Design a protein around this nucleic acid. Structure first.
Lengths: 56, 229, 119, 122, 115
RNA sequence: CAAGGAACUCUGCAAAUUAACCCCGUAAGUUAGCGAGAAGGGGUGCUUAUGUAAAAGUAAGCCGCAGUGAAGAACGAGGGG
RNA sequence: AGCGAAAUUCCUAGUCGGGUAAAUUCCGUCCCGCUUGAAUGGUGUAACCAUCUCUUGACUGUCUCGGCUAUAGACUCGGUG
RNA sequence: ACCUCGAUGUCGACUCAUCUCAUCCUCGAGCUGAAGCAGGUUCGAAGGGUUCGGCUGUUCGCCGAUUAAAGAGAUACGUGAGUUGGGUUCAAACCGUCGUGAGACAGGUUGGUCCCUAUCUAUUGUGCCCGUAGGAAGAUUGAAGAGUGUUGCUUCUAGUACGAGAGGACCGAAGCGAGGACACCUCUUAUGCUCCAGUUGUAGCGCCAGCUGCACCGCUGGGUAGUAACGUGUCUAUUAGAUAAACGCUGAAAGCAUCUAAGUGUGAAACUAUCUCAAAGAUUAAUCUUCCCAUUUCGCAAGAAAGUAAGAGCCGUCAAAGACGAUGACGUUGAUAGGUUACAGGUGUAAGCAUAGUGAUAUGUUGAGCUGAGUAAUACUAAUUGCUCGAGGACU
């Protein structure tokens, strides 16, 4: 393991171009009508009607 | 030599005693009569073979193109298909009765996909040696170490091409020959075959006439345990 | 290796499983990792099913899986389970508890899930 | 599998006590010690009353193996001890009153000289 | 399509036996084995105590040890095997299905044998 | 980790076994101290009764893979400087 | 005097006996002592050595002949770097 | 002393081998003061193999043991960004020799400081997006590649021939071998630490019992699925071609002979395939099949709302898959995983009661109890009623 110079600038960005974070495909909520995300809980808390998450 | 073929799934490993003071592990392969997808006579196809479909699934679990070709060819929706080569004597909608097309004693070959192993060491699939297991010096016991190609001014000052390094090990469709035939069960359309088949128990098993021999029938070695009280 | 934190061990895992199953029996809702929820629910439902035979042999058999809490203790937990929790669960052949997947945790971005017991 | 330098007692009535392998007859990386395999031995301990010099390099045939041997008939004959017989110049033993059983795995190779007088063949 | 895995046993209806008594790993039995050299066929009544009684239907193997000239000779046989006759002699009591400590047992030092 | 037991090399270096207590036994040499706890062998669990201040122990019986039962215990012998 | 290929021998792997199928490792044996050798003392010596050598019983993953069980790193994820 | 002194780690031991043939054999053949077997030289000739020990720091060197075989050369006398260092290029302690002397002995016994978190090219497998050119889903193939290209004994033919006899075959057929590959771990092994059981101390579960923690995980014996091997099955062939060594045929130069001048066949373990496997980013994008698409009017031309419907993807369950990706099935109409029950299979008569026992305890209840993976029913639980890219022959 050894290197004899420093890295470039564009290739450095290309290496960091593969470091993109994960994406999130949102989903609509029929339980309450607010924003939500797929396979997760809603904002109000209702799930299969079963309201389970408290806002406060 | 029109090499007949048959598909199935290996659904068991057993051991059946035979003659000549020996026992032979006899596996079982289960399948159902398949439906031919088509035939190829070599004039522009560049080879002669027969595409056969199998693993029939229900209609709502298949894409429109393939299933549409299936009903247009008088076939049911199937999950898989493959071409058996050097064999074209098919007719349309032929239900596969393998116990008649294959006798009880020929030496046949079997193709199957192996069990996947991912990224493993080099002692498997290449069969090399490892470092010092003991003897009390340092802490190496399994490594490659020497990968020398040249160390100097112009000896090689590079590396060779082609690596005997295991990639995604396992799950490769390979054909092994010299498998004998043992018996048949028409009730379940199952075939008892000498020797286990590669891959997970239940994987694809293709049985065809072998190339090492043109098919030599051997008699059944009578060792059935009819010894009751 | 030199002296250090041993990470996580099977004994620790089973002890944590016992801790959470006793806690959820005490209250009825526990937040955790989904993997741990799947690990715990097997023993949880097996024990609930065992509680429906209603004999002292079951009382002996279930004793190696109960821990105390601030509100209740092992004896109180087992008596409550045998008296009121079990008679409700005679109308379901398994699937006694429910796990609901929440959002990621705010400390390590871990998939969180809340496990509760509802008939 | 027994490798080398192993000590074993005698079975045929010859008059020796301890013997050790001096040359394993076979091939490179044989790594197997099945029965009926000829081997070259040296008598590590021969009392003077016997007919074999102590340390005489001679030919033996192993009839018992503490390692064992997996039978392919579906049965399995296993020995818990290592024993052999000293063959004199073709296949015949130097002992007469055979003591202990002998395996049938060497019957396929003949050796009727030993098996015509042994106690039992298994 | 479906693999019931009952076909494992549905094909075993050929290699089975019903003459073998149900014994344990602490019982003394005997078995006659033929030795056919094309004439003067011998019969070996190999007898002794069992050290393992286990099987899965085709894996029904068992180990039996005899003492000849002081030498303990142990042989294993599959239940589904031609040219055997498993004749039971006496049944003791054992706690495990595979034991190996009795090879050190000798006369006036063996375990108590059940009637 | 079945089996080989130092065959790998200068290669017995971490590697196993002997251990606590109790009862025999212990070679050569010795300047008479030793060697020596040489080396080599055997027992320890439970119950009953006896011992005693208890202690081990004692006699009878019991079991199984064991009975310092887990955690704590010495490998050496011979030749040369 | 003593010992002698030495804790030291160019010729040397000198030679003999044995352990060793195999042994400049070990011991003793002879001696043109290149250049051994009594107060930079010798010969041998009684136990012992957190020294080495070889033989021996005992213990083997020491290799035959590979890994196993689980973690710890490792690898993805989030925070710092 | 040409090139490196502002380094370009040199003996090893080790795993891996690679290249050459001026080869040891497995090959074929020529000839031989080759009666035959057993032979010897040479030719074409590198596909493959060419071991296990002690001894010397030592790959140098001795012999031991076999096999058809224990061949030689080059890789920094191969490989310390691969590991300890045994002499040797750290020290010294001691013997001997020598210098008047600090000290030298390339003589001798002993010990003896090996760091590197992988940047780029090759590189093992997969990936982000894109192309395969109306869109999408498949089926293919074979330019070029890889493995396979190893090999002995016994029996029959055959003690037949030859040779007075001894000695004693070359060919072919079968079995058995060795190494290696491939598969499964049905049998057996180590292992299978939230499985069971024997099982002791201590301290907890109110106490006796029956549980619990630690004692490796208390030790020990087994064991579901499953890993691997020492577990068991196969294979090294046949065939189309072709020169090579050698024999040639007709046959001239050189009125014949003469393999050569035209072709011809016999024709090497070697060569190309036949055997097995990936493969069109193989842009030489090669070949084929299927499914889908039809709302004027503008805007640098076909979108002004239709904007896949063919499908694929985000996400969850799975998973014998498995560094993350990854591919495959399921997505509620869903048996896709988990659960309840049942089964395979394994552990082993559960606790308690009763009888005898003052009491260690023996028997019945009981083939009872139990378990993480293997199997079956079962929507009992979850994967719900979601979101993104994504239709019109642009061009020959």
């Amino acid at each position: 393991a050894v290197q004899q110079r420093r890295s470039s600038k564009h290739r450095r960005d290309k290496r960091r171009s593969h470091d993109a974070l994960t994406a999130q495909a949102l989903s609509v909520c029929q339980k309450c009508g607010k924003k939500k995300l797929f396979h997760r809980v809603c904002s109000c808390g209702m799930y299969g009607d079963l309201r389970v998450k408290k806002a406060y | 030599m029109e090499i007949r073929g048959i598909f199935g799934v290996k659904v068991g490993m057993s051991q059946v005693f035979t003659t000549n003071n020996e026992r032979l592990p006899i596996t079982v392969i289960y399948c159902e009569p398949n439906q031919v997808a088509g035939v190829k006579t070599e004039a522009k196809d560049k080879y002669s073979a027969t595409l056969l479909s199998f693993d029939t699934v229900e209609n709502k679990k298949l894409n429109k193109p393939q299933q549409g070709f299936f009903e247009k060819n008088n076939l049911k929706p199937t999950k898989h298909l493959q071409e058996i080569r050097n064999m074209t004597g098919f007719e349309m909608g032929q239900q596969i009765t393998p116990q008649n097309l294959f006798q009880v004693g020929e030496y046949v070959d079997v193709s199957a996909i192996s069990k996947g192993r991912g990224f493993t060491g080099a002692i498997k699939r290449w069969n090399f040696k490892i470092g010092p297991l003991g003897h009390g010096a340092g802490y190496p016991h399994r490594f490659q170490g020497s990968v020398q190609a040249g160390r100097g001014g112009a000896s090689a000052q590079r590396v060779f091409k082609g690596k005997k390094m295991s990639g995604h090990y396992g799950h490769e469709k390979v054909t092994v020959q010299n498998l004998r035939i043992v018996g048949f069960d028409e009730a379940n359309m199952l075939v008892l075959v000498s020797g286990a088949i590669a891959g997970p128990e239940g994987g694809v098993v293709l049985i065809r006439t072998a190339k090492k021999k043109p098919g030599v029938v051997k008699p059944i070695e009578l060792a059935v345990q009819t010894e009751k009280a | 290796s030199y002296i250090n934190k041993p990470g996580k061990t099977s004994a620790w895992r089973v002890m944590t499983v016992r801790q959470q199953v006793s806690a959820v029996l005490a209250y009825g809702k526990i937040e955790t990792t989904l993997k741990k929820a799947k690990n715990t629910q097997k023993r949880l439902d097996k024990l609930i099913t065992l509680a429906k035979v209603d004999n002292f042999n079951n009382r002996r058999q279930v004793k190696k899986w109960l821990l105390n809490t601030n509100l209740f203790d092992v004896d109180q937990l087992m008596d409550h389970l045998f008296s009121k929790v079990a008679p409700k669960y005679e109308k379901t052949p398994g699937g006694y508890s429910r796990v609901l997947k929440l959002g990621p945790r705010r400390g390590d971005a871990t998939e969180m899930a809340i496990l509760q017991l509802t008939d | 599998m027994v490798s080398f330098m192993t000590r074993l007692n005698v079975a045929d009535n010859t008059g020796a006590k301890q013997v050790g392998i001096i040359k394993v007859l076979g091939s490179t990386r044989k790594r197997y010690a099945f029965l009926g395999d000829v081997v070259v031995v040296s008598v590590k301990d021969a009392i003077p009353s016997g007919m074999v010099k102590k340390g005489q390099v001679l030919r033996a045939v192993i009839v018992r193996t503490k390692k064992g041997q997996q039978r392919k008939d579906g049965t399995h004959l296993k020995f818990d001890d290592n024993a052999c017989v000293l063959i004199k110049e073709d296949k015949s033993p130097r002992g007469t009153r055979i003591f202990g059983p002998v395996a049938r795995e060497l019957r396929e190779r003949g050796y009727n000289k030993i098996l015509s007088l042994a106690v039992e063949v298994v | 399509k479906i693999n019931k895995q009952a076909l494992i046993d549905l094909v075993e209806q050929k290699q089975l036996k019903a003459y073998v008594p149900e014994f344990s790993a602490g019982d003394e039995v005997n078995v006659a084995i033929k030795l056919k050299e094309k004439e003067k066929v011998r019969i070996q009544n190999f007898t002794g105590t069992v050290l393992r009684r286990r099987g899965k239907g085709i894996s029904e193997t068992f180990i039996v040890r005899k003492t000849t000239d002081g030498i303990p000779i142990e042989k294993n046989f599959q239940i589904h095997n031609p040219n055997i006759s498993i004749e039971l002699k006496r049944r003791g009591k054992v706690r495990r299905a595979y034991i190996s400590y009795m090879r050190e047992r000798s006369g006036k030092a063996a375990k108590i044998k059940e009637r």
